[PDB]
Structures are given as C-alpha cells and as structure tokens.
Amino acid sequence: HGDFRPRGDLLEPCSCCFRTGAIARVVDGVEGVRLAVREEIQKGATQIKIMASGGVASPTDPIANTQYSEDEIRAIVDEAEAANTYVMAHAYTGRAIARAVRCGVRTIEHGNLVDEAAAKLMHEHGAFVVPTLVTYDALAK
Amino acid sequence: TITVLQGGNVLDLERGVLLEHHHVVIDGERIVEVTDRPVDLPNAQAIDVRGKTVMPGFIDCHVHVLASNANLGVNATQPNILAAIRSLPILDAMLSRGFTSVRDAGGADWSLMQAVETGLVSGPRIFPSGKALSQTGGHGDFRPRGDLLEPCSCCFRTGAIARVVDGVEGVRLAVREEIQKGATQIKIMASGGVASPTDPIANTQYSEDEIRAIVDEAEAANTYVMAHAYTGRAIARAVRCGVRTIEHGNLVDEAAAKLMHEHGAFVVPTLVTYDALAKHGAEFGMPPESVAKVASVQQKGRESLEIYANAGVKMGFGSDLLGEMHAFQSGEFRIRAEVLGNLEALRSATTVAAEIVNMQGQLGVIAVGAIADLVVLDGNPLEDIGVVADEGARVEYVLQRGTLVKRQ
Amino acid sequence: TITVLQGGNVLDLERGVLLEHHHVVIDGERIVEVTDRPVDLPNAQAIDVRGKTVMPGFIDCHVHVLASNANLGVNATQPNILAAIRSLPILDAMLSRGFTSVRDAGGADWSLMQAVETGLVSGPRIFPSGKALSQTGGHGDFRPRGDLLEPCSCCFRTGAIARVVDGVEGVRLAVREEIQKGATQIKIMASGGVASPTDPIANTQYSEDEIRAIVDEAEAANTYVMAHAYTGRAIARAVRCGVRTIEHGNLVDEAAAKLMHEHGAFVVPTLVTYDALAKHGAEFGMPPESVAKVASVQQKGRESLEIYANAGVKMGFGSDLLGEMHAFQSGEFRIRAEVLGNLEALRSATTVAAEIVNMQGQLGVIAVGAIADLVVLDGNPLEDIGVVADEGARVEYVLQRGTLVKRQ
Amino acid sequence: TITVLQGGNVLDLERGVLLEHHHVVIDGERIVEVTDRPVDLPNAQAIDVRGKTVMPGFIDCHVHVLASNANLGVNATQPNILAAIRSLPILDAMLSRGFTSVRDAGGADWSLMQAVETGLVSGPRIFPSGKALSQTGGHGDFRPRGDLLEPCSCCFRTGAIARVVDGVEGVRLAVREEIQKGATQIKIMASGGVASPTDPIANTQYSEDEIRAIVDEAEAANTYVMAHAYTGRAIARAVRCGVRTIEHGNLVDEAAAKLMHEHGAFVVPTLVTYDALAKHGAEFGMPPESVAKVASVQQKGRESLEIYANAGVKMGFGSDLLGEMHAFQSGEFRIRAEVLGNLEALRSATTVAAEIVNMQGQLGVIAVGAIADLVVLDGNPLEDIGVVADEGARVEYVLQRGTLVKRQ
Ligand SMILES: CP(=O)(O)N1CCC[C@H]1C(=O)O
Ligand SMILES: CP(=O)(O)N1CCC[C@H]1C(=O)O
Ligand SMILES: CP(=O)(O)N1CCC[C@H]1C(=O)O
Ligand SMILES: CP(=O)(O)N1CCC[C@H]1C(=O)O
Ligand SMILES: [Zn+2]
Ligand SMILES: [Zn+2]
Ligand SMILES: [Zn+2]
Ligand SMILES: [Zn+2]
Ligand SMILES: [Zn+2]
Ligand SMILES: [Zn+2]
Ligand SMILES: [Zn+2]
C-alpha cells in the first residue's frame, strides 16, 4: 500500500526516505523492518505506522488481501514497544485486522470491513480504531 | 450482443452424458440460457450446431507459452522481442486446438495476459506465474557446472522461465515482486528435474522454511502455489508445507498420494511431454544428459495416474511441451483416457481444471452465469477421445468470451 | 524461382520518365532484366501490370516503429512484451503503404530486423539505430524536473527510443555496445527537441568531444552517425564534427546548408509529423508544453526545403510519426511535392534514400542487379502525387526481395 | 487589468535624472506609458504617488536565500523541511526592502522559483543556480580535516549551498544535472574563500579544463557561468576560460580588470557581508578561523571598486549576507555610493544588474514594454542614498509584475 510504482517494472527506490513528499517507504524482511523501525525512531517518530492490508490510493493491491508476514509485524511491534511506543496499522477486512491485533498492534486505521468477530478481538486485546469515513465520501465525489 | 448456438448436443460433465438438441444462449460474454425448448430469437445471431457436440473450451494447467525451443537454457538467452514474437504462433495453435484458457507455468507474464484480453493478440486466456522460483543450482538454474556469476538478468530475460532465489526473506521478496508484476499464482521448483544441467531427479529443492514462506505470501494475496515435484519424498514435504497443486508427480507412492487427498491438493500430470522427449528429445536441440534423465520418469507416468485415481487426488490437464513439440498438445487427452476413460480425461481439462484456476462455476461448464468459452465438436468425445486428440481435426467453432474466434 | 511483371510503366528516376510497356524480370530476390521486347516467359510466373506504374519500394529514412503512442515518456515505461506486440500493426501498415525499407531512428534493435528478414514478422526491412544516444537532460532524457535517479533500465526497456549516456568514454562504450547489439547506424541527439519536456529546441546537446568520439567509433565500424538537430548553429557543429545525416533540420540558415554541401552531408526533414501534431497534439495524449513547442518548428519547415535545394543538399524521405498518427506516413509525399515537385518528392523515397542507407546500387532503383523491392502503382505519380500520398490508396502490389507481400 | 501610478517622480537611469509628476500606466504585468500628459482613467485603478520617487525594483546579483545561519557547515546539515521553512522570512524581508529580483548563488532550486512566481510564497523573483560547483576540499567542501567518506547527499540536503564535483567528465555531467533541475545560471568556486574549513583565499580551485567544460555546457543551454574568485591570479584564469561574472573579486590588480573589460566580464562585489562578519562573525556561530580569514578581504574591498571603475569593468549589486545578517542587505547601496557616487550605486541594482541576468529592457528600467517591477521611494535617492539604505526605511509601495505586493 506504500508502494506506488506501476505494474511496469521494479528498480530500487532508495529515494523513499529522501523524498519529503512520500508518505511511505518500502521495506521487507524481519531484520529489514527492525532496522526500519530503529531508523524511524532515531529520526524522531512518536509512533510507528505500518500498512497491514491492501487499500485504495495504491495501484497494484486489492483491499481484500493482507500485507506483511506475522514475523514481520511482531518484529515491528516489539521494536516499537522497546522504544516505549506502539504500532498503528492500516487494515480494512476483518481477516487483516485480526492478525495485526494478534501480533500486538494498538491502533487500527480505517477498519471499514470488520465483522463482529474481529471487533470482539479488539475489545479483548485493548486495541483502538481510527475510522476515517469523510475521505471516502470525498474521493467518491 | 446476443448470440444463439442452436440444436447442438451440450456436454454435461457432472452427469456424464450429452444433452442433445439443447440451445446455448449467449449475451455479451456470458451464458444466459441452456434449454431444449423452441427458443425465441428476435435480434439474435445464430449458428447451426445440430448434430455436433457443444462443450466448454479446454483449460491447460501447465504450459510454457514462451518456450519457443526445447533448450530452456538457450531459450532464456534469446533477445526479448524475438522471444515474444515466437510465442504468437504457439498461442494461436493452442486456441485452434481448442484451448481457451491456459495456465503458464513460468515464462509468460501480465503483458501477455493483457495482449490476449484486449484483443491485441490471438490466443487463450493466460493465468501467468511470471518467472518460476528456483533455488541455486536448482531446476530453474540453467548455469552449467562451470562457474557461478550473478544473473541479475533472470528478471530481465523475457525468454527465461525461472528466476534464482534463495533464502526465507529472499523468496518472500520474490513472491511480492511477482504478485505486483501481476502473476495469478506462484510457481516453485521443489525437486530436481529433466531439463536442467546440474541436478538429479531424486533430490529435493528448497527448505521447508523457504516453502512455508512462499505459501504464506501467496495466500496473503488470495492465491496459491504450484510446485514442480517428482518423488513421493519431495511431494509430501511440499504438500505438508501447503502447496495447492503438484506439477508432474510421476514417481509417487500411495502414502504421498494419501497425504495429497487429505490435504486437498491437486495434481497436474504432464505425460505427453515425456513421450515427445522420448522420440524427438536430442533431435530438437536438447542436451544429452537431460534426455538421459527423461527415460527414468516416463516409465512410472501411467502407473502414477492409477495411484492418483485410487487415492482420489484430483487431476488437471497439463501438456508442458517445449518448442516445435507444442504440436503434440492435444495428445495428452488420449493418454489420460487410455488409463482413466475419456469421461475422466475430459474432466481433466474442463471441470477440475477450472477448480484449479479458482473459476469453479465461472469456467469449464455450460451453465447459466458462466463465461462463454465454448467449443463445437464434430463427433462425441465420450465415444471417441480421438475427436479431441487429433490436433483439433474435428473442432470447427471456438468461442471465447462470447465472440467466435476460430472458424475451420 | 523466376517472376515476370509484364507491360509495366517503369519509373526511371535519374532520366525522370515513365518507360511504358517495359517488363521487369525477377530471379529470386534480384532484378535480372528490364526490357520492352516480348520476354520469353516459359516456367516463369507472371503478374499483368499493363497500364500501371512500376517503381522502386519506398525508403522512409526516419521512423519510430516502437513508438506505439504519442507520449514517448510513457512509451518507454510500457512492458517489454506489450511494446514489441504494438509495433507489429505499425510495421504491417508501413509495408502496405509501399515502404519496403525503413531506417529506424531509435527503439528497434536487431531482433526486429531478423523478425522481418526471417519472415516471422511482416513489414519493411529495418535499418535499426538501436537506442538513440542522448545526454543528461537531453532529448532522450524523459525524466521529470523533480529529481534524478539512475536508469540502468535505459537499455532494458524495449519501448525506449533512447538511452542516457554522458562522457567521452561513456559515449564511446555506448557506441561499441550498440554496434555489437546489431545496429546498422548510430543515432544521437545533437540539439534540443520537441517531445522531451526539459530542453528548448534552440540549445545544443553533447560537447564536440563527445560527438567526434561517436562519429569515429561509427566510422571504425564501417557506418555513420545520424543526428537530430534543429537550429543552423547545432547543425553546423554536428556536420563539422563529421555526422553524415541531419534529421529534421527545420531552422537552418543558408550558411549552415552551404557547409552541408561542402561536407557531403544529407538531410532527412520530417514535415508530416508537425502538421499532425498541429491538429492532434495534446489530442493524442502529448504533454501541453511539447504541443506549445510544435507550433514553431513547422513554420520554417517548407521554407527549409528551398534552402537545402538552393545549397544542393541531398534530401531523404522521413515521417517521424508517433502512435495512431502513423497512418499519415504517405502524406509527406504530398507536402514535399508542393515545394519541390513530384520527381524530387519521389527521389526522397528512392534514389537519395538508398544512398543514405548505403545501398546505392542495391535499392531504390529498377536496374539489372538490384534487389526486387517493387511497388505496382495505379496511375502516374509524376503527373499526380495523389496516387502515392492518399494513405497508399493506389498501390495494388508490393514485392519485397522477389516475393509478393501485399495485394490490394 | 490596468493600474495607474500618478504624479510620481520617475527615475531615468541612463540620463541620470528625476522626471517629476510623470505618470506610469500599467497593464497586466507590463508598463505601457511613461508620460507627464494628464491621465485618462475610465476603468483604471489609481495609486497616489505625489512627490515620491518612482524607480525600478532592485536586483541583487548574489544572495543566499537558504542560508538560515552563518555557519554553512551546520546550515548544510539541517533537515530538508526546516531548511526550506527558515528561508521564507529571509525572502519576505528582501522583497519588503525593495528587492524584486534576486540571483541566488547556491542553495535555491527551481521549486522556490516556482513558489514565488505562482504566488505560493511572498518574495522576489529568483534566478536559481541550483548548487554551487566545488572541487574536493574546495570552498564548497564543508568536511573538516578528519577523513573523507563519499557524499551523494550533496544534492539531497536542501540546505547545502554547494555540491562537490571533480574531473572534466564530472563537471560536464554536473552542469547537465543542474540545468535540467531548472537552474538559470551556473555557480562555481574558482578559488578559496572565507566560510570553508580547508582552503586559504590565495589558492585557485578547478583546473582550466574543468572550468572550460562548465562554461561550454552552460553556453550550450544558452546561459553563463558565475565564479567565486578573489585574487587577480584566480580571476584572470577564470576569465580566459570564459566565465561571464565574477563574484566578490576583492583582491584584483588592474591587469586583471583590463582583461575583464576586454572579455566583457562583469563583477558582483559583495562588500557588505565582510563588514557584518567583522563585528558579528564570531558572534553568530561561524567558526573563528573563518573570522580570522575575513581580516584581509575587507581591506582592499573598497579599493577594488575604483579599479573596476577605472578599467571600465561593469559592476553589479551583491549582498551575500548569511543568516540573521540578512537585515544588513541595503547597506551595500551606501557603501558603494561613498566610493562611486549614488547614481552609480543605483545603476548597480537596476540597469547593470538587468544585463547580468540577461533581462536588459525587461527589468531594472522604467520604459514602454518593461515588466512592472516598481518601488515607491519616499524622498530622492539621487540626493540622499539613505532613503534606500536604511533597511528600507523609506519605501512604502512595491509592485511586482503588475500587482502590488507591499504597503508601508
Ligand atoms: C493515505 P491512506 O493510504 O490512509 N488512504 C487515502 C484514502 C484512503 C486510504 C487508502 O488509500 O486506503
Ligand atoms: C521446465 P519443466 O520442469 O516444466 N519440464 C519440461 C519437460 C519436463 C519437465 C522437466 O524438466 O522435468
Ligand atoms: C521522436 P523525435 O524526438 O524525433 N520527434 C517527435 C516529433 C518531432 C521530434 C522532436 O521531438 O524534436
Ligand atoms: C559562501 P560565499 O563564497 O558566498 N561567502 C560567504 C561570505 C563571504 C564569501 C566567502 O566565504 O568568501
Ligand atoms: Zn491508510
Ligand atoms: Zn516442472
Ligand atoms: Zn513446466
Ligand atoms: Zn528527433
Ligand atoms: Zn525521430
Ligand atoms: Zn555567495
Ligand atoms: Zn563566493
């Protein structure tokens, strides 16, 4: 969801940190995300944001399928927690929410496509939701 | 926008019989009415099908559209434009043989899927895998026993069927790359094979941690993994790691077949490719130590089919022919019928095949709601399998998404 | 083996006349006889060309076969397979307009040259430039004003017209690379252009040290350098550094054209593209600032034709059309004939063009020994340039290396 | 739209007078009429400028917009967000001091030029240099005497004044890079200076081959090269290569000035920065070895102004202040006036300055056709220079491209 390169071809985006207009950066791997979280914290971040499912404003990812492995999400969560902070996570479907919450993310962004099952899980795990409904009416218009 | 096939004998693969004098009503790209009743045709365009079999267009679950010659190491090294140009006849031949949908097992990509779907290229609908995933010195690694320098060109060569990736995180990145590139499913090499220089058939490829990584990232894109495996040892480890379809699988035991049934896994045997490499292997440019290896798997090929039927492992239609041997493509029907009966052999390419590509109900059936991928056949395939398996001698009409593509 | 055109009106271009009731006899790929005597046709296959114009096959000295759409920035970024596919209808259309040979000015490689020569692909014989050579921020630099990231993809994208290379040794290596990739001649961007967003047409590209190096490394490989330049300033420095042909050349002065005569340098103007981009500029998806730049070069376009003619500079035929504007290719015949007269407009496509591609005795003329690249035309081109310049309306036969390829 | 300045005292610079009660007619962005005849205003907006000097907007030929603080070492290392932010008061202040156009000598890019011209940012028109070119250990190299790791961050860091490039091909690409990023001219360090760690003022930087490569590339994009050079030795070699303007130039001999006159090379002496660095150098965080280095350049600074006047070398206006010292900007008017007379000091930022930026008869002169960049000045600058040089104490209206931007 943070990758904005078209379906054409893939050369390395080393610019992802350098470009101040970029909302996101691409990083893969358990040790790759640990380093990424450490980088963002020393840069000054107060919480860590991950993309944990597909979305709207990115071209090559359907909203239904989940992003990041559970070993990658746990690595981030634990590196966030180690710097006395938490993880916020973009997630639409109940499937994608449940796993993120089970890996220990604190806030779920959007969360539009929940069931009561994944909602019951957030209650028990002490997880917050930030719905952003006003942007969906804006983008339809 | 409305087309009526009238008077034909519709094949029902669930029941196992022709439904004679039944009309198929197409609107746009979909089938709206399957009926024997005097159908009202106001603004409808008709084709007379009386006394000819109407059936769904076949689906091949294992092709290499981009394999223009039998030496896959030299097929990789050919220039990009020329590699693309050469696949256009191959695609066209498949469509004429009756294949409306093929699943590419390594080679073709999103571009070729686009070319056939916009109508820029005549061919079957492609379910691409992109590049197949192979470990170092594995079945996709076409480097000779000499020396190991990095082929960064593995993604850049259009003619290459596979890319070489090692490591749990390494293969994870490759899957993510292949899915954003636009592959519909992920292909890996879980054992040694025939058409590769440096590897025996009996040994296994990738670690279980590497396969589980791949399986997880494919599922996280709502798709599945196809794995190349021969031995029962290599199949069972792959299936336990959660691969959905097993390609080839010539050397199974019934324990590995039992596990496949229990895990709900599929098999795509590819028996015609070993028969063609038996006659015209070394003739058509394939290296001698590969044609050495082709002898030892074609023996157990028909015997494996029995085990798959016995344990009840669902079987899909696969050809896997390389180069000029692509002509033999329809002949896999005859081989499967010779062991399983042609009801089962037609089921390989229609009902079970559409389940594999996750189009259960959408493709491979003549029902209300399905896409109009249809074939008109001069004879009854239930009686004689040769009416299908004669390089399309007895196929006159091939309809693809409602529109008629082949008139012969 | 042997083909006879009978009763033809053979165009002799140097004598400027129509030799009516002359037979052209072909053996294999070459013209064996031109005669008005009754030919003893025995085994020979005959085409009756009574009361129709027989002239050599046209040679467009400036095409972009791989320019499938009008935005060259977006053309480069399309998938490699799709890029290749989309060029096939373009090539096919060019041949059926009469162009039996083309000189590709950037994009097409040796693969496309083989595709046509092997007969895998229908279309004109291609003299590929490979990729064009452009400096950073140059005419082949399609990167936005945003910021600069390195493109190793410049060589990799088959949809890319050019590549970005800078430095004496950098361009030297570039030329040796392009030649071994199979190019027949070398393209460079010697000045600003219209398509690229960053550079004005008034200013020059590449230092004289770079241009000389590129010329010397082309000459050492028994070939030449074709150069894109607009202003007389830019043209002077290109030709004094030793380029053989100048593309476009819209804004020459007579002192620049005098030097071109004095070095023996050719010019291929491409006037049909600006008149296309006048009516359909941003209409066919080009950036607005490119369409703002296209308004100024056309003005002195027909003007320059006279300037070269006064100075005695041999002029070739070029279209330089992009995307769906490719159909206007024959419209340059008209545009040229207005200013210079039809005989000279036909010389651009034939005798001058063949000298530019270094095939003087072999192509562009009906002589005993030349290659059989022939156009059978209905009506007189010398008396009416409309029989050529109406999208190829009055061309019924196209013969290429003996074999007949088009029938209309 | 249409606006009338009425009853103003219009300053004719080439004739050296104040034409009183002359009206000024603006239409859109340019000046239509400069006359004393009664004003016909039907639907025209009026600004009452009775008994006040109407004169063209001041042009500074050497600023550092992004220089948020005096130490350029710590100015480079500041974050990209915060670097851009701190420059916005600095730009605003210049405009309110009557400066309508500035020529940035390193730091400001095309982004800031866009921000002012599309009214997103209050400030003067910027003529960006991009980054100043410097060699390794040169005047732009702000690395200490510790050790040398590779800096590709030079372009990345927005608060960096300069980038470090070396070699003939190195600078050739560097110029090409900066031009496509949207520079209007090229800035080079052609000797040592004050605000750098490793270089004394006496020694020259870049080889003659590097400077020539920079000059040839700038001329190829129809612009020129500005060069930082102190000593007469350093100035002469830069001029023989062909730099068009010399920055500072505090330590000239008359031999070097004679050469500059003959080569048409301008000078932008920036004396007001050194006086500020004499009292507030160590005070505002710039390292004390740079404050030690500033001792010698300020002495001959006033003495150099006479040499250029004597040899006929054209002199432009330059502040070159860093950080909070940007308040002192106007002081250079008064400093010059004491040596050369206030009429000459007003030519520095108007008519001579507009030639430097290649905008002669467009900016810096009130005429029919000239862009409406105008400054209303309370009192007469020809009598009292303090009406201009008192941080803009006596300026109320500033108009830029037709529209009014200031009211005081
Ligand atoms: C910046 P974002 O990725 O949170 N976003 C923008 C609009 C909806 C939502 C989306 O693309 O799913
Ligand atoms: C490239 P592939 O693995 O599909 N293959 C080609 C022929 C048989 C089989 C093999 O080499 O074992
Ligand atoms: C493909 P090209 O760069 O030769 N070209 C297209 C139209 C005119 C000319 C130009 O941009 O200058
Ligand atoms: C960075 P710069 O060369 O513009 N500069 C700053 C103050 C005086 C002058 C100097 O260092 O000599
Ligand atoms: Zn989001
Ligand atoms: Zn296989
Ligand atoms: Zn295969
Ligand atoms: Zn061009
Ligand atoms: Zn061109
Ligand atoms: Zn400066
Ligand atoms: Zn300086």
How many CA atoms, within 13 angstroms, populate the side-chain half-sphere of residue D56? 30
Same domain, residue pair C35 and C140: no
- Domain shared by C401 and C255, yes or no: no
CA–CA separation, D383 vs B113, rounded Å? 80
What 3-state DSSP class applies to B120? coil
One domain for residues B342 and B275 = yes
**Optimal mutation site among D82, D156, D158, interface A, most CBs of chain A within 10 A:** D156
Residues B207 and B253 in one domain: yes
Q: Where are the alpha helices (DSSP H) in C107-240?
A: 110-118, 153-156, 168-180, 208-219, 232-240
Task: Give the span between the Cα atoms of D178 and D162, in whole angstroms.
Answer: 11
SS3 D279: helix
Residue of D269, D270, D357 lying closest to D321 (CA atoms): D270
Yes or no: say if D354 and D362 are a contact pair by the CB < 8 Å rule: yes
Question: How many other CB atoms are found less than 10 A from the CB of residue B149?
Answer: 7
C-alpha dist (Å) from residue C388 to C58, C377, C382, C383? 10, 8, 10, 11
Return the closest-CA partner of residue D290 out of D72, D65, D132, D63: D72
Residue nearest to atom 2 of ligand 2 (CA): B195
Q: Which of B206, B118, B193, B204 is nearest to B167 (CA)?
A: B206
Residue C399 corresponds to which amino acid? L
Separation of alpha carbons A86 and A78, rounded Å? 9
Take atom 5 of ligand 2 and give the residue whose Cα is closest: B195
Determine which helix (DSSP H) or strand (DSSP E) holds D310, and give its type and residue range. helix D299-311
Measured between beta carbons, the chain A residues lying within 8 angstroms of D81 are 20
Domain tally for chain D?
2
The residues whose Cβ lies within 5 A of ligand 9, an ion, are C 105, 320
Q: Confirm or reject contact between A84 and chain D (CB < 8 A).
A: no
Q: Is residue B84 less than 8 Å (CB to CB) from chain A?
A: no
Phi, psi of B61 (to 5 degrees): -95, 10
- Of B162, B170, B107, B173, the residue nearest B138 (C-alpha): B162
Inspect the interface and report whether the beta carbons of D81 and A18 lie closer than 8 Å: no
CA-wise closest residue to C293 among C250, C241, C331, C246: C250
Are both C13 and C85 inside the same structural domain?
A: no
Using an 8 Å Cβ cutoff, are D278 and D290 in contact? no
CB-based burial label for A15 (10 Å; 0-12, 13-18, 19+): middle
> How far, rounded to the nearest angstrom, does the alpha carbon of residue B374 sit from its chain's CA centroid?
18
Say how far apart CA C46 and CA C44 lie, in whole Å: 6
Residue C5 sits in a domain whose CATH number is 2.30.40.10
Q: Is there a contact between C81 and B109 if contact means CB atoms under 8 Å apart?
A: yes
- Nearest ligand for residue A135 CA: 1
CB D68 within 8 A of CB D75: yes
3-state secondary structure of B324: helix
Handedness of CA A111, A117, A122, A125 (dihedral sign): negative
Sign of the CA dihedral B192, B194, B199, B200?
positive
Structure tokens at D358: 């290649």
Ligand 3 nearest-atom number relative to CA C294: 8
Co-location of D210 and D298 in the same domain: yes
Q: Name the residue at shortest CA distance from atom 3 of ligand 1.
A: A57
Is there an interface between C and D (3+ Cβ pairs < 8 A)? yes
D224 and D300 in a single domain? The answer is yes
Last residue of a domain, which of D342, D360, D378? D360
Resolution (A): 2.8
Q: Is B158 on the interface with C (CB under 8 A)?
A: yes
> Quick one: C220 and C355 in the same domain?
yes
Query: Hey, how many other C-beta atoms are within 10 angstroms of the C-beta on A4?
Result: 15
| Ligand 8 centroid to residue C367 C-alpha, Å | 33
Residues B271/B302, Cβ–Cβ less than 8 Å: yes
If you compute the radius of gyration of chain C from its CA atoms, what whole number of angstroms results? 21
Q: Is C91 on the interface with B (CB under 8 A)?
A: no
Q: In what order do the strands lie in the sheet with D132-134?
A: D162-164, D132-134, D186-189, D225-231, D245-251, D266-268
In B168-290, DSSP assigns E strands to 186-189, 225-231, 245-251, 266-268
> What is the extent of the structural domain holding C369?
1-57+361-408
Classify A28 as helix, strand or coil: coil
Q: Are residues B173 and B205 in the same domain?
A: yes
DSSP letter assigned to residue C396: E
**CA neighbor of D348 nearest in space, from D380, D390, D298, D305:** D305
Cα separation values, A5 from B301, C73, C285, Å:
45, 15, 21
Q: Which residues line ligand 4 (CB under 6 A)?
A: D 105, 139, 161, 193-195, 228, 273, 320, 322
Buried b (16+ CB within 10 A) or exposed e, C132-152: bbbbbbbbbbbbeeeebeebe
Report the distance separating Cα C348 and Cα B49, nearest Å. Answer: 57
D68 three-class SS: coil
Chain CA centroid to CA D6, Å: 30
Going across the sheet that includes A107-113, the strands are A48-51, A87-93, A107-113, A128-130
**Hey, what are B217's tokens?**
């990232």
Tell me which residue has its CA closest to atom 11 in ligand 4. Answer: D194
CA of A5 to the centre of ligand 1 (A): 16
Are B358 and B368 in contact, with CB atoms under 8 Å apart?
no
**Residue D364 Cα distances to D97, D375, D384, angstroms:** 15, 10, 20
Q: Do B98 and B200 have their domain in common?
A: yes
Q: For residue C248, which of C198, C200, C201, C199 has the smallest C-alpha distance?
A: C201
User: How distant, in Å, are the alpha carbons of B120, C91, C281, D24 from that of D39?
Assistant: 69, 68, 45, 9
Dist. CA D4–CA D42, nearest whole Å: 11
Q: Is B254 exposed, middle or buried (0-12, 13-18, 19+ CB in 10 A)?
A: middle
**Distance in angstroms (rounded) separating the CA atoms of residues C208 and C230:** 17
Burial A23-48 (b: 16+ CB within 10 A, else e): eebbbbbbebbbebbeebbeeeeeeb
B145, with CB counted inside 10 A (0-12, 13-18, 19+), is: exposed
Instruction: Mark whether B47 and B101 lie in a shared domain.
Output: no
Nearest Cα to Cα of residue C54 among C378, C337, C351 = C378
DSSP string covering B47-109: EE-TTSEEEEPEEEEEE-TT--SS-HHHHTTS-HHHHHHHHHHHHHHHHHHTEEEEEESSS--
CA distance B30 to B44: 14
Tell me if C171 sits within 8 A of C209, measured CB to CB: no
Q: Name the region of D240 (left: φ>0; alpha: ψ -120 to 50; beta: rest).
A: alpha
My answer on whether D102 and D133 are in the same domain is yes
Nearest CA to ligand 3 atom 3: C195
With beta carbons under 8 A apart, name residues in chain C contacting D173. Answer: 136, 166-167
Please give the Cα distance from D247 to D250 (Å, whole number).
9
Read off the CATH number of the domain in which C299 is found.
3.20.20.140
Alpha carbon D398 to chain centroid, angstroms: 18
DSSP classification of residue D339: H
Q: Concatenate the DSSP letters of all residues of D106-151 into one string.
A: SS--HHHHHHHHTTSS-S-EEE---SEEE-TTSTT----SS-----
Amino acid at D376: V
Mutate to test the pocket of ligand 1, among A3, A108, A135 (most ligand atoms within 8 A of CB): A135
The string of DSSP codes covering D160-210 is -SEEE--SHHHHHHHHHHHHHTT-SSEEEE-B--SSSSS--TTSB-S-HHH
Record the tokens describing residue B141, joined without a space: 């690694």
**Is it the case that chain C and chain A have 3 or more CB pairs lying under 8 Å apart?**
yes
DSSP single-letter state for residue A11: -
Tell me, what amino acid is at C342? N
What span, in angstroms and rounded, lies between the C-alpha atoms of C135 and D173? 9
Name the helix (H) or strand (E) containing C250: strand C245-251
Task: Give the whole-angstrom CA distance, residue B45 versus residue B25.
Answer: 10
Name B304's Cβ contacts closer than 8 Å, sequence gap at least 6.
B249, B250, B251, B252, B269
Q: With contact defined as beta carbons under 8 Å apart, do D392 and D124 qualify?
A: no
Tokens of C115: 């595709």
HEC readout, B222-241 = CCCEEEEEEEHHHHHHHHHC
Asked if the C-beta of D181 comes within 8 angstroms of chain C's C-beta atoms, the answer is yes
Strand ranges in D232-383 using DSSP code E only, listed in sequence order: 245-251, 266-268, 374-377
Contacts with D403 (C-beta within 8 Å, 6 or more apart), sequence order: D29
Give Cα A124 to chain centroid, integer Å.
Answer: 21
What are the strands, taking DSSP E only, across B295-391?
374-377
Output phi, psi for C286, to 5 deg. -80, 145
Contact B90, B326 (CB under 8 A): yes
The two structure tokens encoding residue B302: 């028909």
